[PDB]
């Protein structure tokens, strides 16, 4: 299983980003003992799905803003506030 790092270009629409995040520093980890920010949901045919985001992706950066060590509220505010277009850097396990 390769750990790959991808850029995902999400265009915000009237339906938001079409994703959910779980985790964050100081919260219950989504995956093992890694309390980072993970994609827990992807809205079918939503902006994130069109851009190629997958559930289980770990969010590393948003438009160059690092959120690897963000707590949950920090990541929410970055994802809400920081652009009509969000270029996410994510890490993903690939077969």
């Amino acid at each position: 299983s390769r750990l790959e790092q991808y850029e995902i270009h999400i265009e915000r629409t009237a339906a938001g980003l079409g994703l959910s995040i779980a985790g964050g520093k100081g919260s219950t980890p989504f995956k093992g003992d890694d309390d980072g920010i993970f994609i827990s949901r992807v809205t079918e045919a939503g902006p994130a799905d069109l851009a190629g985001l997958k559930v289980g992706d770990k969010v590393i950066k948003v438009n160059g803003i690092v959120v690897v060590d963000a707590d949950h509220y920090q990541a929410v505010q970055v994802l809400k506030a920081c652009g009509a277009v969000l270029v996410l850097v994510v890490q993903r396990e690939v077969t």
Partner: peptide, 8 residues
């Protein structure tokens, strides 16, 4: 610990 999930 909190268990947060936020739809966006």
């Amino acid at each position: 610990l909190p268990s947060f999930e936020t739809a966006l």
